[PDB]
Amino acid sequence: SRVRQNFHPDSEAAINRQINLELYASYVYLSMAYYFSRDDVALNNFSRYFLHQSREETEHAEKLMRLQNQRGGRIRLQDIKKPEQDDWESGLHAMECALLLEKNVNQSLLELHALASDKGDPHLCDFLETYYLNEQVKSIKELGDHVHNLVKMGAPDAGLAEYLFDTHTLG
Amino acid sequence: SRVRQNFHPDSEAAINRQINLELYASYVYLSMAYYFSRDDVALNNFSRYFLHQSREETEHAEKLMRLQNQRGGRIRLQDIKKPEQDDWESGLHAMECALLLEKNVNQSLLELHALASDKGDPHLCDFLETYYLNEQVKSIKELGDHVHNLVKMGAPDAGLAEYLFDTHTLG
Amino acid sequence: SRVRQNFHPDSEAAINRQINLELYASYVYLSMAYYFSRDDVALNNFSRYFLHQSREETEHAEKLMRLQNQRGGRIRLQDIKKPEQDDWESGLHAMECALLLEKNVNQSLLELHALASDKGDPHLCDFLETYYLNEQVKSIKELGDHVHNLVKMGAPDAGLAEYLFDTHTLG
Amino acid sequence: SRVRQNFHPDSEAAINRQINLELYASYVYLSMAYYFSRDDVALNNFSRYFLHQSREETEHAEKLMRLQNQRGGRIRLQDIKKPEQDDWESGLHAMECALLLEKNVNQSLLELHALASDKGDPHLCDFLETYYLNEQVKSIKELGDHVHNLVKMGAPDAGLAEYLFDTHTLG
Amino acid sequence: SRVRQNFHPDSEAAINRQINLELYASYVYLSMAYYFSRDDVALNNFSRYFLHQSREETEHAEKLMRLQNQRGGRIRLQDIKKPEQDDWESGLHAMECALLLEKNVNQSLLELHALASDKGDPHLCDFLETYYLNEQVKSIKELGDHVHNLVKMGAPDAGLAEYLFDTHTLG
Amino acid sequence: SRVRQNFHPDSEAAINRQINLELYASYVYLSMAYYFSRDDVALNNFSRYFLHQSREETEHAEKLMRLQNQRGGRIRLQDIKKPEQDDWESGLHAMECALLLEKNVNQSLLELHALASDKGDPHLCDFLETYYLNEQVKSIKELGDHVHNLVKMGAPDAGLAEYLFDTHTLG
Ligand SMILES: [Au+]
Ligand SMILES: [Au+]
Ligand SMILES: [Au+]
Ligand SMILES: [Au+]
Ligand SMILES: [Au+]
Ligand SMILES: [Au+]
Ligand SMILES: [Au+]
Ligand SMILES: [Au+]
Ligand SMILES: [Au+]
Ligand SMILES: [Au+]
Ligand SMILES: [Au+]
Ligand SMILES: [Au+]
Ligand SMILES: [Mg+2]
Ligand SMILES: [Mg+2]
Ligand SMILES: [Mg+2]
Ligand SMILES: [Mg+2]
Ligand SMILES: [Mg+2]
Ligand SMILES: [Mg+2]
C-alpha cells in the first residue's frame, strides 16, 4: 500500500475487531429501542433514548471504518451477532445491561489503546484518546446515574418509578 | 396480547425474517460505502451514494420493526450476516451486486405480500404495497440505469469511465 | 462502585490532592486581586487580571472534581491554605509570585500525568494533556512575558512603569 | 492610612473573620454541589442548586473584601476549613445542613452588625443591613421551605421523594 | 530561562530541525504551485491546490516556532533548501512527489514524538498528536487518493486525464 | 517557447535572482517576527508588525514568480539563506536591520530595472515601476520613521521606550 506508514497488522486486526464490537452495541441498543415501544412496555422515552444510543454507536463504527481506510488498512467485516435477549425485562434491566455493555466496549477500547502503545502508533493512541476513551467514560457515568435513580425510585416493582423516570429524566 | 387482531403467526415470522433481510442489505451497502473511500479506489460519490443507500435500508428495517410492535407481534432478531465480499472490485461490479441484491429483497417482499394475501391481512398487504413494493421498483430501475451507463461507458477497464460517472451522475 | 473501571486508588488520591492545589491557586489569585484594589496600590487592571485568573483556577478545580465523579472516585476535600502573603508588594512581585506558583502547579500536574502513565489510565492521561498541560504552558509563558516587560520597564521603582503596564497591557 | 475614617480596628477584624466565614460557606456548598453529581446520588438539580449557592457565597466574600479596601482596612486571609462531611447523605440531609449553616452565617452577621452599632459605624451598619441581613432571611426561609417539603414528601426513605423534588422544585 | 520547565535540549533541537523541515515542504509546494501555472503545463487547479498546501505548511512551521517560544526554547533557523526539481514533469508526478514528501514529514514527526516520549514531555507529545500526527494522515490519504485516480485515469499519457482531474476533482 | 517575446535571458536570470532575494527578506522578517514573541523580549506588536512584513514579502516573490511564467521564462529556485542573526537584540536593532535590508532589496531592484532598460523590455520596466519601486520607497521611509522615533525615545536602554512604541505606534 502507498498510504500505509507505521501501521502494525495487529493494530489493523484490533480495529477490524473493534468495528464489529461497535456494530454489535448499535444492534443491542436498536433491540432495546424497539423493546420499549412494545404495547406491553410502552415507555416511549426509553425507546427514543436507546434508539439515539444505537445510532450513536453506528457513528462509532464508521469512524473506525474511516480510520482503517485512512491508515492503509483493509476493513474486514464479520457477522453482527444478535443480542443476548429480545425481552429486556424492564427499564431498569435495560439500563443495567447497557451499563455492563459499555464497560466491555470500554475494556476492549482500553485493550486496543494498549496494543497501540506497545506498537508505537501514537496516531492511533491519539485517535482512541480523542473520540472513544472519554465518550465511554461519559456513557458509563450517565448509564450509572440512570441505574442509580431507577433503583432508588423502586424499579421495576414500583409501578410509578419507570413511568416517571421516562417522563421526567428521559423527556 | 391485547392489541393483536387478524395477525397470523406466519406473517409475524415473515416480518421477523424480512427485518433481518433489511438489516443485511444495510450492511452490504455500508461495506460498499467504505469500499469506495479506499485510497486505491477513491470514488467519493460512489462512497456517499452507497452510504445513503445503507441508511435508507436501516430505515426499511425500522419500519418493519415498528410494524411488528404495532400489530401485536414480537420482534425476534437474528445475526446480521457479513456481506459476500469486502473487495467490491469496481464501481460497476458494486452496482451489479447492488442490483442483484435488491431484486432478491424484492423477491422476498413479493413472497411476503403473497403470504399476507393467503392469510387475509389486508393491513399488511397495504403496508408492503405502500412503503416497500414501489421503493424497490425505483431502486431496481435506478440501479439498472447506473449499471447500463457504466457498461456503455466502458467500466471498469476504461480508466475514465468510473471517474466520470462518479463526478457527473453521482455528484 | 458500578461506574469505576481502570481507575487506580493512587490516581484517585492524586486527583484529590490536585483539586486542593487548584483551589489554593484560586485563593492566591483572589488575594492578589484584592491586593491591587487597595487605595495605596490602586492598579485596577492588575486587580481585574488576577481576579480573572482566580475564577479560571476555580474552573480548573471543578473539572477535576467533575473528573473524580465521572471515573468512580470519591472527592475528599482538604483545608484550603491561606496564601504566603497578604501584601503582594508590587505589580512586579505579584507577577513573579504568580509565575513561580504556576510552574509548581505545572510540576504537580506533570507528576500527576506520570502517575497516570505508570498506572495505565490513558483516559486520565488524555484528560490532563487536553485541559491542563497546555493551559499551564500558556499561563507560564504569558506570566513570563509580563514579568519581563515590567523588569525592562523598571518596576517597581520607576513610578511610571507599573502604572503604564496596568493601563496599556492589562487594559 | 489616608482613606480611613471612623473605622474601628475591631470592625476591621470582624470583617476579616466574616470574609473567612463567607469563603467557608462557599466551600461547603461546592462540596454539596459535587456530592449530588455522584453516580450513586445523581440529583443534577440539587447539584446545580448548591453550585449556584456556592458562587453566590463567593460573591458575598468579595463584597466584604471590597468593603475592607473601601474603608481603609487591610484584608488578612485565613485558611479555608474543609466542610464537616464529604458524604452529604441525602438531599434532605444536605438541605438541613445548608439551613443550619446559614443560620450561623446569620448569627455571625447579626453579631457583626451589633459590633458596628457599639462602635458608631453607621456606614458598616447600612452595609450589612443592605446586602446581607435580608439575603440571609431569604436564604433561611427558602432553605426552610425546601426542608419542609422534603420531610412532608418522605425523604430520604421514599424513593420517589428526592427524585421528584429535584425535577419539579429545583428544575 | 524563567519559563522553561521539563523541556529537554534534544527536544529543542528536534523542534528546530522540524521547523526547517516544515519550511522545506512549504517551498516544495510553492515550486509545484508555480510549475502548474506554466504556459506549457497550465493546470490552474493543480496550481491552486499546491499553493494552498504550501501556505498550509508555512502555518505548520509557525506553530512549531510558536511552540519553541512557548516552552522556553530558542528558535535557531537554518537555510531552506531548494526542492529536488523545478520541472515537476506532470500532475501525476507532482502528486507522487507530494505523497513521498509527506510520508517523510510524517516519519520525522513520528521520530519527534518518540523523542518526546523518551524524555517525558507529555505536553510536546500532546502537541504533535493534536496538530500534526493526524494532519499528516489526512494529507497522506488525500494525496494517496489523488495518486490513485490519476493512475487509473491514465496520467500523464492520456491527454484527457490530467485535464479532467484538474477541472473535476481539484475544482 | 510559444509565449516568449522580447524577453532577454539576462532579465530571466535577474528575475530568478530577485525571487530568491524576496524569499530571503520574507525569511528575515519571519525570524524577527518570532524573535519578538520571546518571553524575554515580548513585544507583541513588533512581532505582529514583522510577521505582516514577512507575508508581504512572500507576496513580492509570488508576483515575480508569476511574472516569470507570464513572460515565457523558467523559474529556477535556489536555497533560501538563513538570516544573519536569530537574536535581533532589540526593537531598535531589528528596525535598523530591516531598514538596511530594504535598501538592499531596493538596490537590487534598481539594478534589475536598469538591466531591463538596457535590454529594451518596457513591460518589465513598467512591472518594477508599478509594484516594486514605490513599495520600496514607502517601506524604506516607514522604517526610517520607526528608526528615528525609537532613537529619539531612547531605545533600547530606556526601558519605557520600546514598550511604548510597541503599544502606541505599532498598535
Ligand atoms: Au444482563
Ligand atoms: Au502510542
Ligand atoms: Au456479484
Ligand atoms: Au391482503
Ligand atoms: Au515570592
Ligand atoms: Au496513560
Ligand atoms: Au448536620
Ligand atoms: Au451603626
Ligand atoms: Au520523485
Ligand atoms: Au510524552
Ligand atoms: Au545589522
Ligand atoms: Au524599459
Ligand atoms: Mg461505542
Ligand atoms: Mg429495503
Ligand atoms: Mg490551574
Ligand atoms: Mg453569605
Ligand atoms: Mg507539515
Ligand atoms: Mg520586497
Side-chain angles (χ1 to χ4, degrees), chain A residues 1-75 77-171, chain B residues 1-75 77-171, chain C residues 1-75 77-171, chain D residues 1-75 77-171, chain E residues 1-75 77-171, chain F residues 1-75 77-171:
Chain A
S1 174
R2 57 167 67 98
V3 290
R4 186 176 191 129
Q5 188 174 3
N6 191 25
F7 195 59
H8 197 293
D10 303 341
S11 303
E12 193 174 341
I15 288 145
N16 273 331
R17 269 187 301 278
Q18 188 59 33
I19 293 168
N20 190 265
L21 191 53
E22 294 293 345
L23 291 172
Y24 176 70
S26 162
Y27 206 8
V28 160
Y29 285 135
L30 179 86
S31 178
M32 294 175 156
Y34 284 94
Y35 166 75
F36 286 104
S37 79
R38 265 173 66 165
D39 83 89
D40 65 349
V41 172
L43 293 176
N44 296 321
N45 285 329
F46 275 87
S47 170
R48 273 188 295 285
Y49 173 96
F50 283 125
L51 175 62
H52 176 63
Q53 298 300 302
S54 162
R55 292 153 176 172
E56 202 174 86
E57 289 287 15
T58 294
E59 188 58 35
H60 292 194
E62 287 200 46
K63 278 195 208 67
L64 283 157
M65 309 187 63
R66 187 186 165 78
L67 166 75
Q68 188 87 274
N69 276 331
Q70 286 222 288
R71 291 299 305 269
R74 284 302 170 258
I75 304 177
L77 296 177
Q78 302 312 324
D79 295 342
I80 301 188
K81 277 293 199 308
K82 73 151 180 191
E84 303 292 273
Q85 332 171 30
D86 293 291
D87 193 322
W88 294 103
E89 297 193 30
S90 73
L92 177 43
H93 187 79
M95 286 284 172
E96 281 183 329
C97 275
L99 181 51
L100 172 77
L101 173 65
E102 299 252 47
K103 293 175 88 161
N104 296 329
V105 184
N106 206 30
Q107 195 59 49
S108 175
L109 275 146
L110 289 182
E111 284 180 18
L112 215 171
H113 184 276
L115 171 67
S117 290
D118 301 344
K119 293 304 187 173
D121 208 333
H123 170 270
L124 177 61
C125 273
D126 176 79
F127 180 96
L128 299 176
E129 284 180 19
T130 301
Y131 304 100
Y132 290 84
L133 290 184
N134 193 73
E135 252 321 300
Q136 286 301 329
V137 164
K138 297 181 308 183
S139 277
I140 291 171
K141 168 59 161 52
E142 177 177 278
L143 286 177
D145 283 6
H146 293 347
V147 166
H148 163 79
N149 268 293
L150 290 167
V151 177
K152 171 99 163 95
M153 293 162 67
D157 281 29
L160 277 204
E162 290 189 336
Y163 176 84
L164 287 149
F165 193 83
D166 181 274
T167 176
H168 283 121
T169 279
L170 301 170
Chain B
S1 174
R2 57 167 67 98
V3 290
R4 186 176 191 129
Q5 188 174 3
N6 191 25
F7 195 59
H8 197 293
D10 303 341
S11 303
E12 193 174 341
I15 288 145
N16 273 331
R17 269 187 301 278
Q18 188 59 33
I19 293 168
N20 190 265
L21 191 53
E22 294 293 345
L23 291 172
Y24 176 70
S26 162
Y27 206 8
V28 160
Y29 285 135
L30 179 86
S31 178
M32 294 175 156
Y34 284 94
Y35 166 75
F36 286 104
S37 79
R38 265 173 66 165
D39 83 89
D40 65 349
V41 172
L43 293 176
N44 296 321
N45 285 329
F46 275 87
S47 170
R48 273 188 295 285
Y49 173 96
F50 283 125
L51 175 62
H52 176 63
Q53 298 300 302
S54 162
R55 292 153 176 172
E56 202 174 86
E57 289 287 15
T58 294
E59 188 58 35
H60 292 194
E62 287 200 46
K63 278 195 208 67
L64 283 157
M65 309 187 63
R66 187 186 165 78
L67 166 75
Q68 188 87 274
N69 276 331
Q70 286 222 288
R71 291 299 305 269
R74 284 302 170 258
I75 304 177
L77 296 177
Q78 302 312 324
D79 295 342
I80 301 188
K81 277 293 199 308
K82 73 151 180 191
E84 303 292 273
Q85 332 171 30
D86 293 291
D87 193 322
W88 294 103
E89 297 193 30
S90 73
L92 177 43
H93 187 79
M95 286 284 172
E96 281 183 329
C97 275
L99 181 51
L100 172 77
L101 173 65
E102 299 252 47
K103 293 175 88 161
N104 296 329
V105 184
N106 206 30
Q107 195 59 49
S108 175
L109 275 146
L110 289 182
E111 284 180 18
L112 215 171
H113 184 276
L115 171 67
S117 290
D118 301 344
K119 293 304 187 173
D121 208 333
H123 170 270
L124 177 61
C125 273
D126 176 79
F127 180 96
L128 299 176
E129 284 180 19
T130 301
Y131 304 100
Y132 290 84
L133 290 184
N134 193 73
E135 252 321 300
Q136 286 301 329
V137 164
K138 297 181 308 183
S139 277
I140 291 171
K141 168 59 161 52
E142 177 177 278
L143 286 177
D145 283 6
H146 293 347
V147 166
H148 163 79
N149 268 293
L150 290 167
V151 177
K152 171 99 163 95
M153 293 162 67
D157 281 29
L160 277 204
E162 290 189 336
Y163 176 84
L164 287 149
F165 193 83
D166 181 274
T167 176
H168 283 121
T169 279
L170 301 170
Chain C
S1 174
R2 57 167 67 98
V3 290
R4 186 176 191 129
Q5 188 174 3
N6 191 25
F7 195 59
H8 197 293
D10 303 341
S11 303
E12 193 174 341
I15 288 145
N16 273 331
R17 269 187 301 278
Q18 188 59 33
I19 293 168
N20 190 265
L21 191 53
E22 294 293 345
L23 291 172
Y24 176 70
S26 162
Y27 206 8
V28 160
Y29 285 135
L30 179 86
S31 178
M32 294 175 156
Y34 284 94
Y35 166 75
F36 286 104
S37 79
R38 265 173 66 165
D39 83 89
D40 65 349
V41 172
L43 293 176
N44 296 321
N45 285 329
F46 275 87
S47 170
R48 273 188 295 285
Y49 173 96
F50 283 125
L51 175 62
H52 176 63
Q53 298 300 302
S54 162
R55 292 153 176 172
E56 202 174 86
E57 289 287 15
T58 294
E59 188 58 35
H60 292 194
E62 287 200 46
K63 278 195 208 67
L64 283 157
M65 309 187 63
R66 187 186 165 78
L67 166 75
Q68 188 87 274
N69 276 331
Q70 286 222 288
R71 291 299 305 269
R74 284 302 170 258
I75 304 177
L77 296 177
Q78 302 312 324
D79 295 342
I80 301 188
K81 277 293 199 308
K82 73 151 180 191
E84 303 292 273
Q85 332 171 30
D86 293 291
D87 193 322
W88 294 103
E89 297 193 30
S90 73
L92 177 43
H93 187 79
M95 286 284 172
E96 281 183 329
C97 275
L99 181 51
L100 172 77
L101 173 65
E102 299 252 47
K103 293 175 88 161
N104 296 329
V105 184
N106 206 30
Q107 195 59 49
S108 175
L109 275 146
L110 289 182
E111 284 180 18
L112 215 171
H113 184 276
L115 171 67
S117 290
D118 301 344
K119 293 304 187 173
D121 208 333
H123 170 270
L124 177 61
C125 273
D126 176 79
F127 180 96
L128 299 176
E129 284 180 19
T130 301
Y131 304 100
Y132 290 84
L133 290 184
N134 193 73
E135 252 321 300
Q136 286 301 329
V137 164
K138 297 181 308 183
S139 277
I140 291 171
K141 168 59 161 52
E142 177 177 278
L143 286 177
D145 283 6
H146 293 347
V147 166
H148 163 79
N149 268 293
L150 290 167
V151 177
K152 171 99 163 95
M153 293 162 67
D157 281 29
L160 277 204
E162 290 189 336
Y163 176 84
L164 287 149
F165 193 83
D166 181 274
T167 176
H168 283 121
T169 279
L170 301 170
Chain D
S1 174
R2 57 167 67 98
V3 290
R4 186 176 191 129
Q5 188 174 3
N6 191 25
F7 195 59
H8 197 293
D10 303 341
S11 303
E12 193 174 341
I15 288 145
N16 273 331
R17 269 187 301 278
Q18 188 59 33
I19 293 168
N20 190 265
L21 191 53
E22 294 293 345
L23 291 172
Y24 176 70
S26 162
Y27 206 8
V28 160
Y29 285 135
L30 179 86
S31 178
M32 294 175 156
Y34 284 94
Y35 166 75
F36 286 104
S37 79
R38 265 173 66 165
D39 83 89
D40 65 349
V41 172
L43 293 176
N44 296 321
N45 285 329
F46 275 87
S47 170
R48 273 188 295 285
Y49 173 96
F50 283 125
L51 175 62
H52 176 63
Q53 298 300 302
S54 162
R55 292 153 176 172
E56 202 174 86
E57 289 287 15
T58 294
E59 188 58 35
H60 292 194
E62 287 200 46
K63 278 195 208 67
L64 283 157
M65 309 187 63
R66 187 186 165 78
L67 166 75
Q68 188 87 274
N69 276 331
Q70 286 222 288
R71 291 299 305 269
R74 284 302 170 258
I75 304 177
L77 296 177
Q78 302 312 324
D79 295 342
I80 301 188
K81 277 293 199 308
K82 73 151 180 191
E84 303 292 273
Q85 332 171 30
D86 293 291
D87 193 322
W88 294 103
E89 297 193 30
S90 73
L92 177 43
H93 187 79
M95 286 284 172
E96 281 183 329
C97 275
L99 181 51
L100 172 77
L101 173 65
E102 299 252 47
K103 293 175 88 161
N104 296 329
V105 184
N106 206 30
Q107 195 59 49
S108 175
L109 275 146
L110 289 182
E111 284 180 18
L112 215 171
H113 184 276
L115 171 67
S117 290
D118 301 344
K119 293 304 187 173
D121 208 333
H123 170 270
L124 177 61
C125 273
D126 176 79
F127 180 96
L128 299 176
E129 284 180 19
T130 301
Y131 304 100
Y132 290 84
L133 290 184
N134 193 73
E135 252 321 300
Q136 286 301 329
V137 164
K138 297 181 308 183
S139 277
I140 291 171
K141 168 59 161 52
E142 177 177 278
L143 286 177
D145 283 6
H146 293 347
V147 166
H148 163 79
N149 268 293
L150 290 167
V151 177
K152 171 99 163 95
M153 293 162 67
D157 281 29
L160 277 204
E162 290 189 336
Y163 176 84
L164 287 149
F165 193 83
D166 181 274
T167 176
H168 283 121
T169 279
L170 301 170
Chain E
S1 174
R2 57 167 67 98
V3 290
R4 186 176 191 129
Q5 188 174 3
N6 191 25
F7 195 59
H8 197 293
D10 303 341
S11 303
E12 193 174 341
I15 288 145
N16 273 331
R17 269 187 301 278
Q18 188 59 33
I19 293 168
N20 190 265
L21 191 53
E22 294 293 345
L23 291 172
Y24 176 70
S26 162
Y27 206 8
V28 160
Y29 285 135
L30 179 86
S31 178
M32 294 175 156
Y34 284 94
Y35 166 75
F36 286 104
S37 79
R38 265 173 66 165
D39 83 89
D40 65 349
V41 172
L43 293 176
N44 296 321
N45 285 329
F46 275 87
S47 170
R48 273 188 295 285
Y49 173 96
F50 283 125
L51 175 62
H52 176 63
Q53 298 300 302
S54 162
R55 292 153 176 172
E56 202 174 86
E57 289 287 15
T58 294
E59 188 58 35
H60 292 194
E62 287 200 46
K63 278 195 208 67
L64 283 157
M65 309 187 63
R66 187 186 165 78
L67 166 75
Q68 188 87 274
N69 276 331
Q70 286 222 288
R71 291 299 305 269
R74 284 302 170 258
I75 304 177
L77 296 177
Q78 302 312 324
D79 295 342
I80 301 188
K81 277 293 199 308
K82 73 151 180 191
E84 303 292 273
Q85 332 171 30
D86 293 291
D87 193 322
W88 294 103
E89 297 193 30
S90 73
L92 177 43
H93 187 79
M95 286 284 172
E96 281 183 329
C97 275
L99 181 51
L100 172 77
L101 173 65
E102 299 252 47
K103 293 175 88 161
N104 296 329
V105 184
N106 206 30
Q107 195 59 49
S108 175
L109 275 146
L110 289 182
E111 284 180 18
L112 215 171
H113 184 276
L115 171 67
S117 290
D118 301 344
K119 293 304 187 173
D121 208 333
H123 170 270
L124 177 61
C125 273
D126 176 79
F127 180 96
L128 299 176
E129 284 180 19
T130 301
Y131 304 100
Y132 290 84
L133 290 184
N134 193 73
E135 252 321 300
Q136 286 301 329
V137 164
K138 297 181 308 183
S139 277
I140 291 171
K141 168 59 161 52
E142 177 177 278
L143 286 177
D145 283 6
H146 293 347
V147 166
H148 163 79
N149 268 293
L150 290 167
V151 177
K152 171 99 163 95
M153 293 162 67
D157 281 29
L160 277 204
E162 290 189 336
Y163 176 84
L164 287 149
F165 193 83
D166 181 274
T167 176
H168 283 121
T169 279
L170 301 170
Chain F
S1 174
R2 57 167 67 98
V3 290
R4 186 176 191 129
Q5 188 174 3
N6 191 25
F7 195 59
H8 197 293
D10 303 341
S11 303
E12 193 174 341
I15 288 145
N16 273 331
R17 269 187 301 278
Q18 188 59 33
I19 293 168
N20 190 265
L21 191 53
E22 294 293 345
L23 291 172
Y24 176 70
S26 162
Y27 206 8
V28 160
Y29 285 135
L30 179 86
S31 178
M32 294 175 156
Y34 284 94
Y35 166 75
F36 286 104
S37 79
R38 265 173 66 165
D39 83 89
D40 65 349
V41 172
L43 293 176
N44 296 321
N45 285 329
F46 275 87
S47 170
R48 273 188 295 285
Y49 173 96
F50 283 125
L51 175 62
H52 176 63
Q53 298 300 302
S54 162
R55 292 153 176 172
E56 202 174 86
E57 289 287 15
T58 294
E59 188 58 35
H60 292 194
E62 287 200 46
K63 278 195 208 67
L64 283 157
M65 309 187 63
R66 187 186 165 78
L67 166 75
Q68 188 87 274
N69 276 331
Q70 286 222 288
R71 291 299 305 269
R74 284 302 170 258
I75 304 177
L77 296 177
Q78 302 312 324
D79 295 342
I80 301 188
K81 277 293 199 308
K82 73 151 180 191
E84 303 292 273
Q85 332 171 30
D86 293 291
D87 193 322
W88 294 103
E89 297 193 30
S90 73
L92 177 43
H93 187 79
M95 286 284 172
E96 281 183 329
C97 275
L99 181 51
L100 172 77
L101 173 65
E102 299 252 47
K103 293 175 88 161
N104 296 329
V105 184
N106 206 30
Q107 195 59 49
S108 175
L109 275 146
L110 289 182
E111 284 180 18
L112 215 171
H113 184 276
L115 171 67
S117 290
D118 301 344
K119 293 304 187 173
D121 208 333
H123 170 270
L124 177 61
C125 273
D126 176 79
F127 180 96
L128 299 176
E129 284 180 19
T130 301
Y131 304 100
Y132 290 84
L133 290 184
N134 193 73
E135 252 321 300
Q136 286 301 329
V137 164
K138 297 181 308 183
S139 277
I140 291 171
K141 168 59 161 52
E142 177 177 278
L143 286 177
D145 283 6
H146 293 347
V147 166
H148 163 79
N149 268 293
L150 290 167
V151 177
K152 171 99 163 95
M153 293 162 67
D157 281 29
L160 277 204
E162 290 189 336
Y163 176 84
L164 287 149
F165 193 83
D166 181 274
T167 176
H168 283 121
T169 279
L170 301 170

